[model samples]
Target chain A: ERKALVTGGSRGIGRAIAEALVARGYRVAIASRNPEEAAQSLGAVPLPTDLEKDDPKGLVKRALEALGGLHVLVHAAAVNVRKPALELSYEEWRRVLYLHLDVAFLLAQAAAPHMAEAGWGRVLFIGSVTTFTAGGPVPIPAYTTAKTALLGLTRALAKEWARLGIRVNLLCPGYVETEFTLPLRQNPELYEPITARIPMGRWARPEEIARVAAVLCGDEAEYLTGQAVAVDGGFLAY
Target chain B: ERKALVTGGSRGIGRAIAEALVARGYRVAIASRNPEEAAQSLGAVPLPTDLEKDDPKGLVKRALEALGGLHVLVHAAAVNVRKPALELSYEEWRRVLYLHLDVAFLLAQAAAPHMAEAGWGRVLFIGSVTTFTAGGPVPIPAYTTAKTALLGLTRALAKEWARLGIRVNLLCPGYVETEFTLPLRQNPELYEPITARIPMGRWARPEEIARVAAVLCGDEAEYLTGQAVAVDGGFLAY
Candidate 1:
């Protein structure tokens, strides 16, 4: 039985991934700013973390402490700074960078060695279709920047870690109706244009992104590393 | 007369973009670790700075002082760490991130205000098609991560700055025959797989990318903001 640690597993795509992983028979522990409810409901051990403010390396230790050993690491945590370039300060900018890029790197650093010791491991990052586009209707520089960079991180780590039996990949969801996108989904004017543009003619449900994520984390995707697959409903083709 | 600053302008894509901008009649300053030769030959002002070590904010101040007032900024400065995640150190990882993300943000923060004050501006980040993929034939995690993040920065700033008459976008070039790819091109085995994958069946010339870059920087692309146009010869399509 494999053990997994999922950040942001209390809700949204992260939560869905946790559910999918558990359904597949993996022993899972979820870390969230607030994780008790989700953990109880999903039957996953609740490991609380403030990803933005907490030490990423420490979080890995906590996850290991809770789960005993780690076979998979999924970075689904996210933060967004919605300001124009002119108005955005370095502090604000770094805040987003720290959460997205910094933490992602640190978690991998702390967790990868353990996985390598085990002879098999999987790492996944929940990115955005914005990885392919500049952005969408709203302004989310910090969010978009960090998510896009995940591609580089995923590839670099995947290639470097592959020989050791550790595979890394990124899953980019196009438009999903998560809490993150609630504001847009609630507004028809903002939602209609995006909906009309997606070739599939609809936004994704969280479960849709999760199923693909589960596959990537499973043994079936052993050969897949340093790849970014966009579940964008043909949004990128146009 | 509009002024422009081209970082990494000493050679490769940055140098090409500088050449294109100068040909378009813009007063240009090319920033490089050693800008003298390229500046002298291109007939543009030479602004020398170490992008990885220098203060990104100060670079903008110096560019403004030299070029008069900036109407365009092309962030083509780049650094790479071709190592696996397991072997890569935090310092190496950060060195790439700082050069790519930190410098990008600080430069934009410093330069965008000037552009906004002037009522118009254009910012182009020379990214890689790796923004769409994971790692390529090599393990360039830091390089790939930084390049991909440009999408968020481009779009976030584009939308936020658009109302103020500035357009921020990204140009991701696929396979270009540049000094960066020299090693790969020299080795047939390493090159064949990539070449065969490109839909157009050939790599791009710097001028090919530079020409499209010039168009984005010009008034002709005024309405285009928050977009990532890939000049990949159909490489991403397959």
Candidate 2:
């Protein structure tokens, strides 16, 4: 059975990605701060992990044991500190970097070797359009910095691991309506300008991001690697 | 007097940018392997330096002396080794990374402090569409990797230097008519596909890119920083 592990799978686009994979016949395991509830909700295995604190090897090992084997890894967890660049603390900056770049790298290092051993593997990183465009009126310097670097990591890993039969790609989702986006959506002051900016003229549904993400991991996308694919409803294009 | 130093300024987009800066009355300095001719043509000072071989600090120091303290810095030097990801050597990878990321950072570090002392400054990095999009049929893993990382550096520097009265941003030019674009433009097979992908159905003129870049450095753009602006003629929009 094809088994996949998704971080931040407790809700939102991560939840949607896990659901999409399950529908595609993969045995899915979810890792998140509160994975049990979502796992019960989806009939998928749960492994509660503090990705920020947990050792990536130990987390992946647990997921491997739960799923019997792992064929794919998707990292979707993220954090953003929305202070102006002038006020953003160094600690705050490092916190965002740790979760987005450091943890992502560690997880990949731990999981990729196993995938290579299996002779087929896929790794998907969830980045943001901020990687391609500038930060909006709301300042997210650390978030923007880390997400931008992640694309380079995707290119580096894709080139290094191609011979190992592992494909690595980044998926940048445009503005999507999720619990994470509630603040932006509730205030027309901030939301209208954003919607107006998007060429699609609206936010993406969580499933919109998930569907494209799943396709990147499927057989049809076998030759695709070291690429940054955006599902952002033309936000970056504008 | 407002002063600017432009690397890769001997030709193409960089040359156009130097000319634009000159037209705007900034005392411009051109840095390239063959800067004398271009500087003579633009009536600007020439600081001929091997960007890849000379230390970034040395180049910046020379520019500062030539231009009587610098207010702006534009690093547009780039190198690409076209080969498959599987065939790319580690040495080749580092060469691109050094020029695109290392030299850029060092140059910024050397120049921004001086600009901050003057209480106003702007830095523009010329990136490629590949930083946002996937590599095309021709593989350029090294170039793609470095340019993608360069955007992250832009964000990092912009945030750090904002309070110092310096604005740092990236200028990712879309397809442009330049000597650098000869290969893709000459090959009908490659050119047609790329042009078709662009929503504007064409590449940008070098002056179009230079005009937007000059504006970003002008008084009107004082508030903008840590942004990635593309002058791609809508190539990214499609």
Candidate 3:
């Protein structure tokens, strides 16, 4: 059975990804800070680990042990600290950077060997539309910065590991209705302005992002690596 | 006298920008870690500061204080840390992100108030064609990541501050011949393959990028903002 480990699978887009993978017949392991919630919500074995502080190698070991071998790794855990440039403190800056970039590097490194051994694997990083268009009504410098780095990491890893048959790519999504984004979605004043700008004229559902993930990680997207695709409802076009 | 600050101003694209700005009659201040060398080589007043740890706000403040006000802020400072993904350390990772994204944000935040006050200022971020195409012969993860972030920062700042009459835009340059890129330029093996891909059949000259910068910073490009304009010899088209 093809097995996958999904970080941040407790809620929102990550939860949707776990369900999608399961429906597609992959045995899934959900890793989140709250394993109990993930187990209940995702209906999969919860490998509890805080991506922010946990040793990524150890976390990967635990995950692989539970699932035996891994065919795919999806990094969805991220921290968005939205502050104007002048108001962002150094510590808040570091915290955001570490969560989005450093932890990503650590987790991906740990999973690489297992993927290499399997000879066929998919590593998908959840990026944001902010990857292409940094301007948001709310300024989240750290979030935007980290998401941008993922693009570089995607290309670098794809160039090196494509030879080994490990496909790595980034799925950049625009405003999607989720727990993190619900407040904005609720505000007609804020939502209407953003919705008007998007060519698609609606915020994306979690499943919309998950569907893209499935395609990228599936057998079909073999030639595609080191690419950042924005599933932003044409938000980038405007 | 019009005033400008060029980060990484000692050589390569930075030197080219300093020269171009000077030719246009702007009193230029070039900031690099090595002030003496930058001054001797570029003939611009050198403001020595480590972009990695130096206070970008303070650097901008000093530039404004010294120059009486700021007209142009060109972020040409960057670092490329290339290594296999698994082999990269956390410190190395942070160093790259800090220089490219963090510094760009800090400097822009500090400079914007002054630019907004004058009701006329231009902020140009030197990005790369890698922001568009991903797979390449070399894997420079850090460099590509930061450049990608600048794309978002350009848009964000442009949308928020354009009404204030400040223009923020990105210049995406393809492979260019410079001290930094000399090794690849001299190597027919590497150079020819990339050149073959480029429709223009050549690498960009630093002066070419500088010329574009000059136009964008000048009064004529007042309407351009929040856009990533590629100066590649059609590398992106393919």
Candidate 4:
């Protein structure tokens, strides 16, 4: 059985990914700061950990011990701080970058070796469509920067570790209607202008994004590595 | 006089940009860490500043003071640490991202206000074909990531700052001959495969890229913002 560990599995897109993996018959574990609540929604074994400061290696060790071994790791936990460049404090900037880029690296580094030892592994990073183009209604420079860096990390890892039977890729979701996006979705002032730009004329359901993640995590996408595939309802192509 | 700042102005693609700007009758101020060498080689006033760790605000301040104000800022300075992901230390990762993202941001932030005040400004980021697709001969994750991020940053800034009379866009070049790319050009093993991928059946000359940059910086590209215009010999379309 393929065992998968999904970070930020309690709610929003993370919960959707966890549920999707479970539906696909994978022995899935959900890791988040609020693991109990995530477990209630996801129905996966909850492994609570604060990804921002937690040792990713420790989380991996615990997951491996519980599941015996893991085949896939999906890093979906990210925080967005929106402010102008001049207005943003250094700490706020560092925190945002650390949560998105540094934590992703730490988790992948910890999990990849186990995947390599097993001779089969998949790493999926949940990036944002803003990674492609940052023409957003809101200004989030740090969020955009970190998500963009994930693309580079994906390519670098894919090239170096392809021979080891490990694949890394990024899934850039368009405007997803998670708790984070609720403010935008509810605000007519913000919502109409953004919807106008999206060719699909709708925000992506969490399931829509998860379905793509499931496909990438599955064996079908073995040859597709070092790619930042946007599941943005053609938001980028336009 | 329309003044412009070109980083890494001592040689290769940067030198080509300097020459192109000069021909366009812009008062070109070429920047390098070593101003004396850049002055001797490029025949332009060299404003020395180390972008890697130099405070971006300081660099912009000096450049603006020297030239009164910049009408265009071309971020042409970049470095490649062509190593596997694991082989790259944190500092190595920072260096690449810092140059492409941080310096670019700093320069744009400083220049955009002045441009906005004057009612017009153009900021052109020198990006790479790798931003689109990345089955490259070498693995430089940091470089690819930074370039990709610039695409997003360009679009975000364009959308937000477009109202302010400032245009931000990316110029993604295909394989261009520079001292940086000399090794790849010399290696038939690497060169032939890349040439095969380019529909034009040839690598780009630095001047070709410079021409595109010139066009984007001129009034012709005023309507085009938040765009990653490829100057690659159809490397991306194919």
Candidate 5:
């Protein structure tokens, strides 16, 4: 069986990707703070570790070991801390970066060598739709900065690893209905602006994002490395 | 006085960016396919070397030496290949990659040191409105592939050099009237279809694209890095 490792794969976009991979017949393994719950919900193997509390590389090693050999890796864990630039504390900045950017880097570094050994692999980073928007709703500097740099990292790694048949690309999703976004959806003030900006005048289901990810991992996406594929509901149009 | 260097600055998009930079009071030097004509036309110090013939890094050296310092580098040279995939030869593929992507990397490496010395810098790459759309009327495979990767190149450099205060981004332009684009204008079938897709129902002027490039090089763009800004009159929006 083809095996895949996904970070923060218990919930939200990561969970969706995990489900998508499983539905496509790949044996899935996930790392999340609540690994047992994720495994229960998604029917995938748990590579349990809290990125905020544990050695991130340890989680990667455990995931690879559990899978025997990993064919795909999706680095997707983030806290989109929403505060203004002036109000953002250094602690919050560090916390956000560590959770999102740092852990993702460590995961990629560890998982990449195993994928390279197999001579064919896929790596996907869950980036933001704002990668194209240049217009951002997220006010937090670190969130915006990290989100922006994710695309950069996608390209950086894609260029270097393409020769190894390790296809590295970004999966940028627009406003999607997810567990983390529940509160925002309830508030009309927050929701309308997002919907209005999108040409489709709506948000995407987590499954839509998942579908794109699955497609990207398939043979059809052979020429599609080093690109940011937005699974947005035309959110970037406005 | 701040000095800005632009490639393909003799004519078309590069010339427009050069003029805009000068209008905004930055001392402008341009590396163009034609030196004397560019100087005569725009009063820009033309570090003339053919992108297809000369060493790309050498052009940067000449421009930096002439200006005494470099603060901004806008790589705008390209051969917009128009042939279909089946018709494109290895020669055309090599030429497209060399002139567009090859020169860009060398120029960035050469000019970034000068920008790093100043503790601040901006690099703008003139990209395509078609960068995102897998849809193409200009179906030249190498051109499409190279154009797409150019944005990737923008982000790769931005990630590596963000700490040094060097901001790298892609300024993607929609259909624009230029000497290079005169052929597109003559073919009404090609021109009308492009305008129909743009929400604004028009093509951008070269000056319009230049204005956005100027803003990206200014203080307002401090937080903006590794982003692709579409100056495409909402072509991609529709």
Candidate 6:
């Protein structure tokens, strides 16, 4: 069976992806900052690690060892906070960017050789629509930056590793309906405008967004590498 | 200073979008069909009428009436020739799809009015390589049918008639430097191994294939509805 590791799997999008990967027959492992929360990602081996401080290479190495072999990685972990751009702290920047972007870079580097040897791999990073759209429901400046930064990293890695038969792409999701996002999804002020803009006219269920990951990571997606596949229901359309 | 149209301003990845539109700095128009060796692309009005056997949108009439008002439309008309997957009459299938796909779809409906009314418009419909790495240099089911149709008609009308001011996006390119790919600089990226799979190797010099289309078109666009931006060094990086 194929093997995969998903970070941020304790909840929401990452958990969904882990679950989906399992259903698709992948032996999956998941990581989270919280062990109890991490346990909720059913069907995955739990990996409790402080993403904010842990060495990313170690995290990837750990997962690789646990999985016996990791052919896919969904780097979907993050910390979301809405600090005004002007007042944002450097600590916030480091914490967010480190987990979201830097970790991905190092992890992919570690994972590449293994994948390269097999001549096939899939790496999916969870990016946000904020890369293209300005302010969002919560106005999380750091989160947007982290997500945007990951997109750039995604492209760079894809370019370098495509020849190795590893494919990398960013999955930029619009407002997804995760338990963590339920408050925002229900708040009319935040919810209405968001839904109005998306052609799909609803907050994406985490599963909806997760499904895109399945397709891209599948055999059919060989030619589908390198671009941001915005599964935002045309949120980027208007 | 600008109003644009492309008769067959299309792609091989069509001319780096072309020496025509951006370089000339003039209002422009194009006629698709009869892919004759045209005059060197030195920008400006080559007002050939009858882009197709039958045009319901009155191609010339619409442009004439919209002249000062005409914003931008790159029909980049095209015809596809495939060596494999033979059986269908090129003429018969092409006539229908080209009309519906290119003219009505790529041309009439593909152009602008909302973009026009807001006094901002762009009608570009030349996408490249394959939107996915599904097939091959040999899989053009119909010139761009199995290929560019996704990008060409992505929300063509939804994005066209949005309540919002404007939004449009188009982008697909491969190591430019075609006769259209001239703008690519001479660099190590020019190497075969590098250019072969491109992580930003030799890229397009022509209009659209290069980011040249961005600066040129950005000056000509607003939000530009959908999205497309590429030199395609990332052509298929999964």
Please compute DockQ, using alpha carbons, for every candidate against the native two-chain complex. 0.02, 0.02, 0.02, 0.02, 0.02, 0.11
Better candidate by TM-score, 1 or 6: 6
- Candidate 4 error regions (>4 Å): B1-238
In model 2 chain A, which range of ten residues has the least summed lDDT? A216-225
Error of 4 at B131 (Å): 12
Over B51-132, each residue of candidate 2 has an lDDT whose tens digit, in order, gives: 8889999999998998889899999885777777799898888888898889999999999989999989999887888888
Give the per-residue Cα lDDT of candidate 5 at A203: 72
True contacts kept of each: 0.00, 0.00, 0.00, 0.00, 0.00, 0.19
Best by TM-score: 6
What is the C-alpha lDDT profile of model 3 across A1-238, one tens digit per residue?
7789888887888887888888778888988888676676666779888787888889889888989898888888856777877999999999888887888888888898898898887888988877765646767887888888998887777666665667787877778888988767887777888887764456778876786677667663444456665656546645
State the RMSD for candidate 5: 19.7
What is candidate 4's lDDT per residue for B1-238, written digit by digit as tens?
Answer: 7788888887778878888888888877888778677666656678888888788777777778878877888889968787778899999999899998988988898888888888888899988887876648777888888999998888777766766767677877778878889778898888898887654456767886787577667764544456665555445544
Candidate with better lDDT, 1 vs 5: 1
Q: On residues A150-188, what C-alpha lDDT tens digit does candidate 1 reach at each position?
A: 888877787567657777878887788899778778988
TM-score, A chain, model 1: 0.97
Per-residue lDDT over B1-238 for candidate 1, one digit per residue giving the tens place of the 0 to 100 score: 8899999998989989999999999999999899999999998999889898888888899989998898899999867888878889999999988887888888888899999889989888877877878656777777788888988887677656766777777888778888977877887876898887664466878877887788678764554456676665545654
lDDT of 2 by residue, A1-74 (tens): 67899999989889999998888899999999989999998879999988888888898999889998888999
CA shift at A56, candidate 4, in angstroms? Answer: 1.7
Residue B227 displacement in candidate 3 (angstroms): 16
Each model's total of backbone clashes: 3, 1, 2, 0, 0, 38
Docking class of 5: incorrect
Give each model a TM-score: 0.52, 0.53, 0.52, 0.53, 0.53, 0.60
Chain A, model 6: TM: 0.92
Looking at model 3, residue B146 earns an lDDT score of 73
How accurate locally is residue B143 in candidate 2, as Cα lDDT from 0 to 100? 85
CA-based DockQ, model 3: 0.02
